[PDB]
Design a protein around this ligand. Structure first.
Ligand SMILES: [Ca+2]
Length: 263
């Protein structure tokens, strides 16, 4: 039952392309283990957590309200909008849109939220303005989903993403209420069952967000730990192969099993 780094390397052997991995201690931020920590990978829908971090930062600044209701039209709807397509008459609140973006990966929700802050370059500026000079969003949905890398638009690195996620979930960049709101949305993720959650023992906490894309791309960002309390950040990305979805999923689940068994 392989050690985590051994399993990550084996996943890469099996899949082709690259697999990147990092594990951070949540309390201290120290890197516990890594593979390809500074190499770029497509974020895919993992960006939607960062987007809601930016929205919450605006809430904390008095520039946005989670209860603000956004109406939109049929023409706004893009691929993979399972929540927003149901609310053409009533619209959705900003907070509902973040729940849809994170928990269901809803693409129209993400686009609507990106509009509230001025687009992908403004999300990049938010990241830069928190000290992440690596991660960048360039595209809207579903173009992000539809894209082949190209290989620097819409990328992060395992360490930049992990670092950034820790800064959103801990410390004081966001208020206590906003850090808790963000982790709640991630805890409520509905579409990442095949990944880390498949390996998760009973009684553990997990808050996560997955992604998938063309050229064998798959990823997950998570805060997890035993006894109902997160205590580590894990980030896993893969890209650059011909792997099927079932194959990508199985490898992420097996990395997950190794990290749990060696915790
Ligand atoms: Ca290799």
């Amino acid at each position: 039952h392989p050690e985590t780094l051994v399993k990550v390397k084996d996943a890469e052997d099996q899949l082709g392309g690259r697999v990147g991995y990092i594990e951070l201690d949540l309390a201290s931020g120290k890197i516990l283990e890594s593979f390809r920590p500074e190499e770029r990978f497509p974020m895919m829908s993992t960006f939607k957590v960062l987007l809601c971090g930016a929205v919450l930062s605006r809430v904390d600044a008095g520039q946005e309200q989670l209860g603000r209701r956004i109406h939109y039209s049929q023409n706004d709807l893009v691929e993979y909008s399972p929540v927003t397509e149901k609310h053409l008459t009533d619209g959705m609140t900003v907070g509902e849109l973040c729940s849809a973006a994170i928990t269901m990966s809803d693409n129209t929700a993400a686009n609507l939220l990106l509009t509230t802050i001025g687009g992908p370059k403004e999300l990049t500026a938010f990241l830069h303005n928190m000290g992440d000079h690596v991660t960048r969003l360039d595209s809207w949905e579903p173009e992000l989903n539809e894209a082949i890398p190209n290989d620097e638009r819409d990328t992060t690195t395992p360490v930049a993403m992990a670092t950034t996620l820790r800064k959103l979930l801990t410390g004081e960049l966001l208020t206590a209420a906003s850090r808790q709101q963000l982790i709640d949305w991630m805890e409520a993720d509905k579409v990442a069952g095949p990944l880390l959650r498949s390996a998760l023992p009973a009684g553990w906490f997990i808050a996560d967000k997955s992604g998938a894309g063309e050229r064998g791309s798959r990823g997950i960002i998570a805060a997890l730990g035993p006894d109902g309390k997160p205590s580590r950040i894990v980030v896993i990305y893969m890209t650059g192969s011909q792997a099927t979805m079932d194959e990508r999923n199985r490898q992420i689940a097996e990395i997950g099993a190794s990290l749990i068994k060696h915790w």
